Every structure is written in structure tokens, then in C-alpha cells.
């Protein structure tokens, strides 16, 4: 069974590196699609309909001039390069990408069930089996990403989508970095930052296992382990080495969380000799059939409402703006590789 994982990951690395070294480019164009509705804004993500087939997709649109202004060139190129190269059940699939005079476009599978964030705030909190179901998918996803030397760095309910079968899709790779060892960028979201990032140390993929602990805590509690009015105050609590648990947390859950929310990155679960297996073998996961999760054969605890293709009810409403395409090419040299 251990040899099956080893062989599986080696094959997956060979497939990733092939696509990483020769990325796909320019596989559709804007007028192949009708715009339907804005699903999210920051650029924008829109529900679109492919005219020829009638298939719906989520199209991320990035304004090249805005990307340059916000100093996001490398992050944007990197996100698209990662997405066209990875392949895993809980990672959103990139169907097409192209660019024009004004914008960059990534057309992804439409994931109709909405952000985990919305469901968690609506319901309040998840029961431990509901939380465990999602957590198992993140564990496997990070095992895959880390085997490719990818550090993810932006785990949070806002960045997890729920598909039609109730399984998770991870979408956003703008802060992911492919490095074998340590790195130094201050990046992420305050509530989810590992202490060694806050402390301006070099850090490694162990930061993702810290963030998994924050996520499990927030799913099971309804609020994250470290919060405050201002980020600086959140940082002080994170590095303090103190955390408090709701009284309804089970003993097994608290012990897992003490080992993921471990300030000493040399004692943190996922970063020890046995790597991810310390997490998979932990008592809280004793009922988890890891292969069945990967194979998507486990009955999901929650299935979002879905009327049919194009239903956007699990997403909020945003002001609709034109998709404008300038007569002049903008920022061509910067985005040659896209």
C-alpha cells in the first residue's frame, strides 16, 4: 500500500513536469463564450456559456494593466502555469486559456456549489465528521502538491469550492510557489499565517500543515483559533503558543490540533520523519477510508442545492461591468508566456 502511493506520486510527478516544461497556450478566444453572471470579484470570475457546446465554465478575467500596477505579474503567470500542469480530483480543472489586448483569461470547470465560506457562515459550524470529510481531502491534496514541491500558502474556506457531489475543489494558486526547500515571502491571510511566516524566518511546506490546523479548527468551531480586531493583534496570538478550544471539541480533535498548530515547526505534524502519515494515522482520522475519499466513493455529508447547468444560486451577487478590450495591446512583453 505504501509502494502504491510511491508509484502513484512518481507517475504524477512525470506528468506534471511534462506540462510544467511545455505549458499550453491560446486554446480558445473570447467570442467562443457568452457571459452570464459575475461569480466573484477581486480581476473577476464569470459564469460563461461555451456557444458551440452549451457547456458552462467559470472564466477568470485579469486586467493586464491592473496586474502590472499591483505587482502581480509573476504570481499571475505562475498560477496559470500551475493550473495547466496539475491533475488531482480536488483541484479545479483548467479547460482553456488565452489573452487579448487588455486581459488574461483562464476558463475553468464551473463548480456550482459555492465557497465553503458561505456554507460555514450560514450553518455556523460543521460537526466533526463533516469537518473530517473536508479535512481528508485537503490532506490528500497537500500530499499531492508537496510531492511536486508546491507550497500552497492560501488555505481558507474562501478558497475552497464545493462541487455537485459535495467534494472540495481548490481553485486559487496565485500565492503557490514551486520550491524544494525554504522560502521567505510574507504572504497569505492573517488568520491562517504560520508563526514562522509572521516572524520573518525562512519557512517550508510545513506552513501548509499549520494552515490545515487553522482550517479544521474554524470548520469545527465556526471561528478560527486566532482572531482580533487588527492583523497585528492576530499575529501576537499566533506566535504566543497558546490556543483555546470550544468545550464540544473531542479529545482526539484537540490532540490533532495541538500537533498541527505547533509553533515549533520541528515538532509539527506533517513535518516529522513520517511526514503526512502522522496525520493520516492520527486517531481523529481512524474512520477515514483514504482510498475511498480519493476515489470519491464516500457519501458526502452535505450536497449543495443545484437546479441545473448554469444555476448560480450558491454564489452571491456582484455589480456587472463591461469586459472591455482595447484597440491597443497592453503589456505584451510582460505576459508573453501566458
Amino acid at each position: 500500500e505504501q509502494e502504491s502511493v510511491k508509484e502513484f506520486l512518481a507517475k504524477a510527478k512525470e506528468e506534471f513536469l511534462k506540462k510544467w516544461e511545455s505549458p499550453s497556450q491560446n486554446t480558445a478566444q473570447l467570442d467562443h463564450f457568452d457571459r452570464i453572471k459575475t461569480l466573484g470579484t477581486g480581476g473577476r470570475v464569470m459564469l460563461v456559456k461555451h456557444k458551440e457546446t452549451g457547456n458552462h465554465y467559470a472564466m477568470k478575467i485579469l486586467d493586464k494593466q491592473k496586474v502590472v500596477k499591483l505587482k502581480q505579474i509573476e504570481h499571475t503567470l505562475n498560477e496559470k502555469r500551475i493550473l495547466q500542469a496539475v491533475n488531482f480530483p480536488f483541484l479545479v480543472k483548467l479547460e482553456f486559456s488565452f489573452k487579448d489586448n487588455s486581459n488574461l483569461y483562464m476558463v475553468m470547470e464551473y463548480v456550482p456549489g459555492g465557497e465553503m465560506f458561505s456554507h460555514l457562515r450560514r450553518i455556523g459550524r460543521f460537526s466533526e465528521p463533516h469537518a473530517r470529510f473536508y479535512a481528508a481531502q485537503i490532506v490528500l491534496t497537500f500530499e499531492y502538491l508537496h510531492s511536486l514541491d508546491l507550497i500552497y500558502r492560501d488555505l481558507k474556506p474562501e478558497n475552497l469550492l464545493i462541487d455537485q457531489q459535495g467534494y472540495i475543489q481548490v481553485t486559487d494558486f496565485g500565492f503557490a510557489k514551486r520550491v524544494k526547500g525554504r522560502t521567505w515571502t510574507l504572504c497569505g491571510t492573517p488568520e491562517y499565517l504560520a508563526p514562522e511566516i509572521i516572524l520573518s524566518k525562512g519557512y517550508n511546506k510545513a506552513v501548509d500543515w499549520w494552515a490545515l490546523g487553522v482550517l479544521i479548527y474554524e470548520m469545527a468551531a465556526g471561528y478560527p483559533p486566532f482572531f482580533a480586531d487588527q492583523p497585528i493583534q492576530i499575529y501576537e496570538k499566533i506566535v504566543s503558543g497558546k490556543v483555546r478550544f470550544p468545550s464540544h471539541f473531542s479529545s482526539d480533535l484537540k490532540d490533532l490540533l495541538r500537533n498541527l498548530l505547533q509553533v515549533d515547526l520541528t515538532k509539527r505534524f506533517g513535518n516529522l520523519k513520517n511526514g503526512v502519515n502522522d496525520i493520516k494515522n492520527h486517531k481523529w482520522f481512524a474512520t477515514t477510508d483514504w482510498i475511498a475519499i480519493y476515489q470519491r466513493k464516500v457519501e458526502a455529508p452535505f450536497i449543495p442545492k443545484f437546479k441545473g447547468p448554469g444555476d448560480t444560486s450558491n454564489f452571491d451577487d456582484y455589480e456587472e461591468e463591461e469586459i472591455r478590450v482595447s484597440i491597443n495591446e497592453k503589456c505584451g512583453k510582460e505576459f508573453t508566456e501566458f
Binding site: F117, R121, E158, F227
Partner: peptide, 18 residues
Amino acid sequence: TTYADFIASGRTSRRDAI
């Protein structure tokens, strides 16, 4: 309560990256 403190934080909406 801790939940009350969470609501009063003003960080219950979608959180941006730094």
C-alpha cells in the same frame, strides 16, 4: 463568549490576503 468576540472582531466576512 468566544463567538461574541468573533462577531465583534469585524473579521467575519471574506478575508483578503495580505
